[PDB]
DNA sequence: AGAGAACAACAACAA
DNA sequence: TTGTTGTTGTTCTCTG
DNA sequence: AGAGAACAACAACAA
DNA sequence: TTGTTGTTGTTCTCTG
DNA sequence: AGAGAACAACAACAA
DNA sequence: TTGTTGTTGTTCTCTG
DNA sequence: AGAGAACAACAACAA
DNA sequence: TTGTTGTTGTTCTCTG
């Protein structure tokens, strides 16, 4: 168990041999740091010791095609393996899922990505169930539901109703999930607020285009190279696109007013009211933070939506110096937050905020329906159908306090609920909604099940996107022949190893 | 940092050399396992490496008299050193202390032991301030207070009033602390209940004496040696003296009815109603658990007194088969619990129970005075006279919830109190009163100070006793010349190293 | 790795840390300051320096340092090993008719086990061996002669000694023990005898009862009245079990007399001492002071002692010489001490005793009927050990001196009688440093067959002291805390320690 | 309790 | 397999 | 004796 | 001079 | 967010 | 001191 | 060419 | 026979 440190003369040969790998094989330096590579390097030492330095490597080392093959099989195995856990989760109501469509760019195969999210032990699960080619089949509602239904079969989940689905507003997909629980991606929602808000504030158009072109120039004119940080362009498809850009100009201002002057093109930047830029950036900076909190799956997020909404509305509160132009923007963002975001929220959203100990907030009418919803929801999950030395010091002094049985029927729904409402949790820096319910699991038997249930619903389809992101790094320019089956396998295996092994 | 494992040939010589130490020096085998010996063995390796295997040991190794001298000085140093912490503690009201008188048995010097107890960080402090010879000075109230006052000066604590003293009922001592906060040792109290209860239940006398003599015989007749476990005698000065004995007979019954029969003295055991014994043992077993919980200083205890009282009263509840004799006993224990224990409790006691989350219990009149006490107590302690990425996710979404300032004046005493009362903590196996207040420190600013303040008051003078116990292992038959100054030093140093170093 | 006599000194900066680290040990672990002066500790510290140099400071001490149980285990092992090892040297000495032993029963105070201590003494080179062979339990067997013998027989097998007859056993007068040795060589403990004499004596002199008790109560008082703390030395009490009990107590009062008359007066209790005849006190401790010395001479095991028995007896009788101003009381005391010395001590010595005095160079003394018997004995003992053309043809002597008929005798040595007789003709001047042992070792040449017999007697201890001492030792192993240590471990811990003292430098 | 101590009958391991 | 070590958990001890 | 222990009051030093 | 060490010699403890 | 990758300017260390 | 390593924290990239 | 990649459908094996 | 491996040869990718 005492890990042996080797000779510096060996360590020296180690370096050389690895570098050469990276060179001869065109691998990234980070290749050696990969955790999975370490473990394999370990097994090759565990062979060298138990077989001696004269092995027939070439025979020992599997051929690519077997690796691909082990993967595809290994896939079916583990998919099958957790078939139960997932199956339980789904049925006991703690399942949440996100789906989106994506397309590679070599064969242009059209895919459906599906992610599952649930609460186990003290952790929140971030699972990729699969990336299935919709084949070359139109890409209609029906066909989506089908492949959706299909991806779940692999785990042996056949009743999809108890699943809370988080998806963007893609006409096709929303219709596919027309008969199930479907929550609107608040990320996509926010971005819609952002896009419409700007569009209806043409007053801002100029300095944006102005800025747009300060980049366009720098790129074209090949002087980006001296900024320390590049001027980031647009790429409108991305979230908080404007922000990232203005911020790039702002972050570099000095260095740029200067190079445009001495290279005599101050014509470019002089019409740009820097204050307006500075200001839009502040407004927008918060959106960036909200944009990020809503894309997290390693912690609950749905609870943060209503507060994100409160944050926008605060940011957009009219302050005193408010330049005429900014102020119009603010009123617009606000107006859109209501007619676009708020309007597309659901009961889930509100409840989830409610499940965040500092509860005082939605007193208004919301508490009412919230309860009623909670009740309806908890009833459904009620269809789960030597002496005195070695005895707990608690049990010893307060025996009437521990009592009898595994089940605790007396404390009812309405009582647990109204019990919650009495709570008073002080907000602490580190506080974690997830822990706090797992603590009060005891005091809140059936309610805590509901809470961790909502608290696991992702706040947006980020999850799905991220998948496609990933699939991308495997369906590469050179790796282009990789097959659907193979891909889904690779993706799944990688998700699994993360969610299921330490 | 990679600890080198040595040659088995060295490890072999290690053994030999150590054994010889134990033999040649008449040391206990456990001598090598002592943590303090390890650390010194480490420093002798750190010398061997940095000076080589040819050192003049004999000169290097200090003479006893310097060791004694370093100790006595080292003493004054650290005593001085924590002078502040203790001083604070005392003043900010979180100080608790226990004192008792004791006498060695070589010079027959008469001592005063003093222990301090307080709450720091997440820990509870078990401190020996000192063992001072009262000299050969009568041992009157005055002289005690004096040496008491004196022991505190060493730390520079001159105002003793804010100190909550836990002591037995020794006429002299109780008078010495006549003007301070003095709480009655509940251990001593319990034992008084036990002793008087038995005495007033002469019906039990016979089988006890019977039993007493079954030991007396076995000891005298030298057949104890074959029991597996000895028959434990009386030693009345000890707590739960009867119990430990009956239990010894009971635990061995078979093996003894048998040896008394085959060695023809069944006359001895035949008059002993075994059931009565069995029963007294059960009654008494709980007392044993209560006896132990009340002697703990590494966790709060005062909170367990009232519940210990509830436990006795439960144990003594009349059950059905109750033999006439047992039943009288039960009624007596009960009667004494009131006129001896309950009667000698104080407000502290009740409050401390109250400071144990499952609070429902003392609803009756007690809550009233408890509050009033708590208030009075808290008023006294009121005489202590890149942007938006690197900002707490809590602070970001709920800023009105974190607010402004270090101090929180709005939430007042009565509000904090009535705030507590609303709490509902479910009792869990592992639950710890100390943690729970340190958690709610936030929500309960001034109250939590009060709570951890009481929660640190030892429930009995156990602490002091234990000290004398210790002092004993230093003022040994051979070590008899050891001096007062030296002793107190040794004791203190050892307390310190425990409370102040990991 | 065998040299370099110049030893390095350390920086007073490291001397400053060893100081710290050692105190901490003593504090943290609760050991006495004297722990570090220990010889064994030192030899061990050395070995840990030798480890750090040969391995570097970053060693895994925990792994290294053996567990306590591993140590106990070794000790029981090492015991068994060395006990077997010396098995020869001992087997020898016993057979070479020059080994003696002690025996006594002792009982511990935790488990209250009942033990049998056995000490062996003999002479090898210019030294006397004082050795503990064992402390075995009688288990819980009655404690009869049969068992004592059996266990005694048994402790000896451990060294492969199966024949005990040739051993000289000195034992007290325990009803039990004397019977177990009924068929062997048993010499009575002179120390126990002396205490016997002392006790009967005082008892048969009630006259002193009063002043003694009187004194006893002055201590009793000083203790109960917490006054002890003010004299230079504490008043001492009786503890009747102890030897020369009364003396140690009287002496304490005497040495502190002033200090106490003063105290008692200023506390209106002068009623306490006023009846104590200081003169008698004085006198008694003077008589008694001698007994102390005799007592202590009788408990030595490093120098011969059996020879000093007779001289001690002579000394007591000399101290009880009626002198002139002798107070009737004291006088009566003396007469009684003498009476008992004759009927208790002298009455229980045996030939071994006499002979052993005789082997002390200044040999003049028991010229008495004693010498006739002594030779007779020495002859028998030296036998046991033997079981391991005219001008030319006529002696140069028978020609030069014919009228010297004498022939049978043989002056320069030859046989036992001659060696004995040539001993007699000696004249050794008793100088201050004279070591009877050294002298016989030198004249081993001069006296071949006699020096053996002599050194053989001279190694027999004068009393049971060694055995008592053993128990005292056993006492420090079977501590309140260290209670639970089993026979095995104890016998080992004890033996090894003795072995290491007697067989190493 | 909370301190020091030994050991029987374990269970972990190196050879 | 077989010994050697170090683990466990029980049994003492002491202050009342 | 022959074992273990601490310490007041030394006497020796290094600084 | 001054403080720090180690030295001596006395006072305890135990077996009886 | 949550994934892979390189590196400048560090700070830790062995010689 | 002087090099060699491995650390940090910033800068890219991608999915929307 | 001259580089990286995955894979359907082979052909070779060990069992 | 039967499954598991490694083989071939074709289909992609990129510089232009
Ligand atoms: Na291969
Ligand atoms: Na030294
Ligand atoms: Na070890």
Distances (CA, A) of A321 to A315, A325, A468, C385: 14, 11, 44, 127
Contact yes or no for B44 and C18 at CB 8 A: yes
* Contact residues of A toward B, CB < 8 A: 2-3, 5, 282, 285-286, 288-289, 293, 304, 307-308, 310-311, 358, 387-389, 392-398, 401-402, 419, 422, 424-429, 431, 440, 442-443
Q: Which two tokens stand for residue B304?
A: 């367990």
| Distance (Å, whole) CA B162 – CA B167 | 16
Is residue C496 a contact partner of residue C74, using CB atoms and an 8 Å limit? no
Estimate in Å the CA A250 to C1' H2 gap, whole number.
27
| Distance (Å, whole) CA B23 – CA C377 | 43
| Distance (Å, whole) CA B358 – CA B425 | 6
Is residue C75 a contact partner of residue B22, using CB atoms and an 8 Å limit? yes
**C88 and C62, same structural domain?**
no
DSSP string covering C452-467: HHHHHHHTS-SSTHHH
The residues of A between 296 and 315 with beta carbon within 7 Å of nucleic strand H are 296-299
Contact yes or no for A397 and B307 at CB 8 A: yes
C-alpha gyration radius of chain B = 28
Q: How far is the CA of A448 from the centre of ligand 2 (A)?
A: 69
Q: Is B200 exposed, middle or buried (0-12, 13-18, 19+ CB in 10 A)?
A: middle
Nearest CA in chain C to B7: C64
Q: Does residue C173 reach within 7 angstroms of strand G, measured from its CB?
A: no
| Distance (Å, whole) CA C229 – CA B110 | 11
In a domain, B4, yes or no: no
Q: How far is the CA of A64 from the centre of ligand 1 (A)?
A: 9
| Distance (Å, whole) CA A229 – CA A252 | 7
Is residue B111 a contact partner of residue B467, using CB atoms and an 8 Å limit? no
In a domain, B1, yes or no: no
Cross-strand pairs, B421: none
**E-strand stretches of A185-252:** none
Is residue C447 a contact partner of residue C416, using CB atoms and an 8 Å limit? no
Q: What sign does the dihedral B53-B59-B63-B69 (CA atoms) show?
A: negative
Q: How far is the CA of B64 from the centre of ligand 2 (A)?
A: 9
Ligand with an atom nearest the CA of residue B18: 3
Helix axes B64-91, C12-29, angle to 10 degrees: 70
Cross-strand pairs, A110: A103
**A39 and A131, same structural domain?**
no
| Distance (Å, whole) CA B370 – CA B501 | 37
Residue with token string 């190279």:
A225
Q: What is the pairing mode between strands C168-171 and C127-137? A: unpaired
Is residue B168 a contact partner of residue B293, using CB atoms and an 8 Å limit? no
Estimate in Å the CA B292 to C1' E10 gap, whole number.
19
Long-range contacts of B144-153 (CB under 8 A, 24+ apart): B144/B99, B144/B101, B144/B112, B144/B172, B144/B173, B144/B176, B145/B176, B145/B177, B147/B112, B148/B99, B148/B112, B148/B114, B148/B176, B148/B177, B151/B112, B151/B114, B152/B114
B450 CB-near residues (< 8 Å, 6+ apart):
B355, B374, B377, B378, B381
| Distance (Å, whole) CA C472 – CA C484 | 18
* Residue of A291, A294, A398 best to disrupt the B interface, most CBs of B under 10 A: A398
Q: Does residue C441 reach within 7 angstroms of strand F, measured from its CB?
A: no
Distances (CA, A) of C314 to A476, C320, C338: 117, 10, 10
Estimate in Å the CA A406 to C1' K16 gap, whole number.
75
**B211 and B187, same structural domain?**
yes
Q: How far is the CA of B1 from the centre of ligand 3 (A)?
A: 19
Instruction: Give how far A393 is from chain B: nearest CA, Å.
Output: 8
B157 CB-near residues (< 8 Å, 6+ apart):
B86, B87, B90
3-class DSSP state of C286: helix
Estimate in Å the CA A59 to C1' J9 gap, whole number.
23
**A40 and A154, same structural domain?**
no
Residue with token string 């060996």:
A10
In a domain, C216, yes or no: yes
Q: Which two tokens stand for residue C16?
A: 């400053």
Instruction: Determine phi and psi for C192, rounding to 5 degrees.
Output: -65, -40
Nearest CA in chain A to B394: A429
Q: What sign does the dihedral C494-C499-C502-C505 (CA atoms) show?
A: negative
Half-sphere exposure at residue B223, Cβ-oriented, CA atoms within 13 angstroms:
15
| Distance (Å, whole) CA A122 – CA C267 | 79
| Distance (Å, whole) CA C45 – CA B62 | 13
Cross-strand pairs, C463: none
- Number of domains composing chain C: 2
In a domain, C1, yes or no: no
Instruction: Determine phi and psi for A428, rounding to 5 degrees.
Output: -120, 155
Alpha helices in A338-428 (DSSP H): 347-354, 366-380, 393-397, 413-420
Cross-strand pairs, A133: A111
Estimate in Å the CA A10 to C1' I15 gap, whole number.
43
In a domain, B72, yes or no: yes
Instruction: Give how far C226 is from chain B: nearest CA, Å.
Output: 7
Chain C neighbors of B223, CB-CB under 8 A: 140
| Distance (Å, whole) CA A226 – CA A214 | 14
Name the closest nucleotide to C300, judged by C1' and CA. Answer: F1
3-class DSSP state of C65: coil
Q: Which two tokens stand for residue A464?
A: 């799905």
Q: How far is the CA of A66 from the centre of ligand 1 (A)?
A: 9
Number of helices followed by number of strands (H, E) in chain A? 21, 7
Nucleotides of I under 7 A from a protein CB: 5, 11-16
| Distance (Å, whole) CA A8 – CA A3 | 16
Cross-strand pairs, A114: A99, A130
| Distance (Å, whole) CA A121 – CA A100 | 28
Q: After which residues is chain B discontinuous, taking C to N > 2.5 Å?
A: 385
DSSP string covering C134-188: EEEEBTBS---HHHHHHHHHHHHHTTT----TT-EEEE---HHHHHHTTTSEEEE
Q: What is the distance, to the nearest Å, from the Cα of residue C356 to the centroid of all Cα atoms in its chain?
A: 16
* Residue of B16, B47, B65, B233 best to disrupt the C interface, most CBs of C under 10 A: B47
Q: Which two tokens stand for residue C378?
A: 């020495």
3-class DSSP state of B226: helix
| Distance (Å, whole) CA C398 – CA A128 | 132
DSSP string covering C435-452: -HHHHHHHTTTT-HHHHH
| Distance (Å, whole) CA C264 – CA C227 | 10
Resolution (A): 3.4
Short-list C458, C464, C463, CA closest to C129: C458
A203 CB-near residues (< 8 Å, 6+ apart):
A324, A325, A328, A329
Short-list A400, C108, C67, CA closest to B310: A400
**B40 and B153, same structural domain?**
no
In a domain, B2, yes or no: no
Domain-terminating residue out of A40, A62, A84: A62
Indicate left, alpha or beta for A475 from its phi (over 0: left) and psi (-120 to 50: alpha).
beta
| Distance (Å, whole) CA C499 – CA C503 | 6
Is residue A183 a contact partner of residue A457, using CB atoms and an 8 Å limit? yes
Chain B neighbors of C47, CB-CB under 8 A: 13-14, 17
Tell me which DSSP letter residue C267 carries. T
Estimate in Å the CA C133 to C1' G14 gap, whole number.
20
Distances (CA, A) of A319 to B71, C32, C227: 69, 77, 89
C499 CB-near residues (< 8 Å, 6+ apart):
C82, C83, C86, C131
Half-sphere exposure at residue B309, Cβ-oriented, CA atoms within 13 angstroms:
22
Residue with token string 């501590």:
C479
Residue with token string 């019409």:
A271
Nucleotides of D under 7 A from a protein CB: 1-9, 15
Q: Which two tokens stand for residue A31?
A: 């290749």
| Distance (Å, whole) CA C384 – CA C373 | 17
Identify the CATH number of the domain in which residue B33 sits.
Answer: 1.10.10.1070
| Distance (Å, whole) CA C4 – CA B444 | 70
Short-list C90, C120, C103, C123, CA closest to C457: C123
**C186 and C242, same structural domain?**
yes
End-to-end CA, chain A: 19
Which residue among B36, B63, B108 places its CB closest to the CB of C28?
Answer: B36
| Distance (Å, whole) CA A224 – CA A220 | 9
Distances (CA, A) of A217 to A222, A238, A256, B367: 8, 22, 12, 77
Distances (CA, A) of A159 to B107, C174, C364, C468: 86, 96, 123, 91
For residue C310, the tally of other CB atoms under 10 A from its CB is 22
3-class DSSP state of C100: strand
Distances (CA, A) of B104 to A369, A500, B145, B206, C222: 75, 63, 21, 36, 17
Domain-terminating residue out of B62, B82, B101: B62
Q: Does residue A235 reach within 7 angstroms of strand H, measured from its CB?
A: no
3-class DSSP state of A126: coil
Chain A neighbors of B394, CB-CB under 8 A: 427-429, 431
Q: How far is the CA of C30 from the centre of ligand 3 (A)?
A: 21
Short-list C185, C182, C174, C178, CA closest to C94: C185
Contact yes or no for B443 and A426 at CB 8 A: yes
| Distance (Å, whole) CA A266 – CA A382 | 71
Is residue C188 a contact partner of residue C195, using CB atoms and an 8 Å limit? no
Name the closest nucleotide to C19, judged by C1' and CA. Answer: G5
Is residue B141 a contact partner of residue B176, using CB atoms and an 8 Å limit? yes
Element (H, E) at A90: helix A64-91
Q: Which two tokens stand for residue A258?
A: 């200067």
Residue span of the structural domain in which A123 resides: 63-502
Short-list A283, A285, A344, CA closest to A313: A283
| Distance (Å, whole) CA B309 – CA A51 | 70
C-alpha gyration radius of chain C = 29
Alpha helices in A441-482 (DSSP H): 445-454, 462-474
Torsion, Cα of A30, A31, A35, A39 (10° steps): -150
Nearest CA in chain A to B423: A423
Short-list B423, B445, B437, B441, CA closest to B303: B437
Residue with token string 């008992």:
C340
**B103 and B76, same structural domain?**
yes
For residue A202, the tally of other CB atoms under 10 A from its CB is 9
Element (H, E) at A244: helix A241-250
Chain B neighbors of C65, CB-CB under 8 A: 14, 18, 32-33, 38, 41
Neighbours of B (≥3 Cβ pairs closer than 8 A)?
A, C
Q: What is the distance, to the nearest Å, from the Cα of residue B136 to the centroid of all Cα atoms in its chain?
A: 29
| Distance (Å, whole) CA C332 – CA C214 | 20
In a domain, A1, yes or no: no
Give the Cα-Cα-Cα angle A484, A485, A489 (nearest 5 degrees): 110
Alpha helices in B177-323 (DSSP H): 186-199, 205-220, 241-250, 253-262, 274-293, 305-315
B389 CB-near residues (< 8 Å, 6+ apart):
A289
Q: Which two tokens stand for residue A270?
A: 């002089």
Q: What is the pairing mode between strands C99-107 and B181-184? A: unpaired
Contact yes or no for C40 and B21 at CB 8 A: yes
Long-range contacts of A338-343 (CB under 8 A, 24+ apart): A340/A189, A340/A192, A340/A193, A340/A196, A341/A186, A341/A189, A341/A190, A341/A193, A341/A309, A342/A309
DSSP string covering C241-265: TSTTHHHHHHHHHHHHHHHHHHHHH
In a domain, A133, yes or no: yes
**C164 and C54, same structural domain?**
no
Q: Is B322 exposed, middle or buried (0-12, 13-18, 19+ CB in 10 A)?
A: middle
Tell me which DSSP letter residue B344 carries. G
Distances (CA, A) of A439 to A395, A435, B358, C489: 19, 6, 16, 53
Helix axes B347-354, B305-315, angle to 10 degrees: 90
Distances (CA, A) of B160 to B141, B181, B450, C83: 16, 9, 18, 64
B221 CB-near residues (< 8 Å, 6+ apart):
B263
Short-list A64, A63, A67, A68, CA closest to A486: A68
| Distance (Å, whole) CA A284 – CA A246 | 10
Short-list B494, B128, B475, CA closest to C480: B475
Solved how? X-ray
**A102 and A37, same structural domain?**
no
Distances (CA, A) of A12 to A9, A16, B478, C88, C456: 5, 7, 62, 62, 76
**A46 and A161, same structural domain?**
no
| Distance (Å, whole) CA A48 – CA A51 | 5
| Distance (Å, whole) CA B294 – CA B301 | 6
C-alpha gyration radius of chain A = 28
**A32 and A91, same structural domain?**
no
Q: Which two tokens stand for residue B55?
A: 């050192």
Element (H, E) at A176: helix A171-176
Nucleotides of G under 7 A from a protein CB: 5-8, 10-16
Is residue B448 a contact partner of residue B357, using CB atoms and an 8 Å limit? no
**C43 and C144, same structural domain?**
no
Short-list A461, A373, A383, CA closest to A165: A461
Is residue B308 a contact partner of residue A397, using CB atoms and an 8 Å limit? yes
Neighbours of C (≥3 Cβ pairs closer than 8 A)?
B
């Amino acid at each position: 168990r005492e890990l042996k440190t080797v000779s510096a003369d060996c360590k020296k040969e180690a370096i050389e041999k690895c570098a050469q790998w990276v060179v001869r094989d065109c691998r990234p330096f980070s290749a050696v740091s990969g955790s999975g590579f370490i473990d394999m390097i370990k097994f090759f030492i565990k062979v060298g010791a138990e077989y001696g330095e004269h092995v027939n490597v070439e025979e020992l080392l599997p051929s690519p095609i077997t690796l691909s093959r082990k993967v595809t099989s290994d896939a079916k195995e583990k998919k099958a393996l957790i078939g139960r856990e997932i199956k339980s989760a789904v049925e006991k109501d703690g399942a949440s899922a996100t789906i989106d469509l994506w397309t590679d760019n070599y064969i242009k195969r059209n895919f459906l990505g599906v992610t599952l999210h649930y609460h186990e032990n003290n952790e929140l699960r971030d699972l990729i169930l699969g990336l299935k080619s919709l084949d070359f089949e139109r890409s209609t509602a029906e066909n989506i539901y089908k492949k959706l239904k299909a991806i779940f079969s692999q785990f042996n989940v056949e009743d999809l109703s108890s699943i809370k689905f988080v998806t963007d507003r893609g006409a096709n997909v929303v219709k596919s999930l027309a008969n199930n629980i479907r929550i609107n991606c608040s990320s996509h929602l926010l971005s819609n607020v952002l896009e419409n808000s700007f569009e209806e504030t043409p007053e801002l158009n100029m300095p944006i285009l102005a800025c747009k072109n300060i980049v366009k120039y720098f790129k074209k004119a090949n002087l980006q190279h001296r900024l320390r940080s590049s001027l980031k362009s647009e790429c409108p498809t991305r979230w908080n696109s404007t922000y990232t850009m203005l911020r790039s100009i702002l972050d570099n201002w000095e260095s740029v007013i200067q190079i445009l002057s001495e290279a005599g093109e101050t014509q470019r930047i002089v019409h740009i009211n820097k204050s307006i830029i500075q200001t839009m950036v502040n407004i927008l900076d918060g959106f960036e933070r909200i944009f990020k909190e809503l894309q997290t799956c390693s912690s609950p997020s749905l609870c943060f939506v209503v507060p994100s909404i409160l944050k926008v509305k605060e940011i957009c509160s009219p302050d005193v110096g408010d330049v005429a132009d900014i102020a119009k923007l603010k009123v617009n963002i606000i107006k859109n937050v209501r007619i676009i975001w708020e309007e597309n929220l659901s009961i889930w959203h509100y409840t989830a905020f409610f499940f965040y100990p500092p509860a005082l907030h939605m007193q208004q009418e919301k508490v009412a329906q919230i309860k009623e919803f909670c009740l309806s929801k908890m009833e459904d999950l009620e269809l789960i159908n030597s002496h005195s030395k070695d005895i707990s010091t608690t049990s010893f002094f307060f025996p009437q306090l521990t009592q009898n049985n595994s089940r605790e029927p007396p404390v009812c729904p309405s009582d647990e609920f109204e019990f919650y409402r009495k709570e008073i949790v002080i907000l602490s820096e580190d506080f974690k909604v997830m822990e706090w319910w797992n603590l009060n699991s005891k005091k809140y038997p059936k309610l805590s099940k509901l809470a961790l249930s909502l608290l696991s619903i992702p706040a947006s389809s980020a999850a799905s996107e991220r998948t496609f992101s990933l699939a991308g790094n495997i369906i590469t320019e050179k790796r282009n022949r990789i097959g659907q089956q193979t891909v889904d396998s690779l993706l799944f295996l990688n998700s699994f190893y993360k969610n299921f092994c330490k």
